[PDB]
């Protein structure tokens, strides 16, 4: 019963954390390669 709504709630909070990570990534230092930034950004989110 709880997980039913937890799905959407997790979606929203995940989007929010994504935006926070995007802000800090664009603030740290403007990396051409996609995986490098992307994989690193994902790693930062999981890690910090």
């Amino acid at each position: 019963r709880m997980m039913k709504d937890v799905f959407f709630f997790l979606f929203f909070l995940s989007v929010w954390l994504v935006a926070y990570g995007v802000t800090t990534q664009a603030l740290l230092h403007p990396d051409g390669r996609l995986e490098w930034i992307f994989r690193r950004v994902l790693y930062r989110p999981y890690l910090q």
């Binding site: 997790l10 995940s14 994989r39 994902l42 790693y43 989110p45 999981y46 890690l47």
Partner: peptide, 19 residues
Amino acid sequence: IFGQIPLDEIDELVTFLLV
């Protein structure tokens, strides 16, 4: 589980499972 995530050995879905 105790805050030790060695991305050097696991990274060359998962996030959803953790949460």
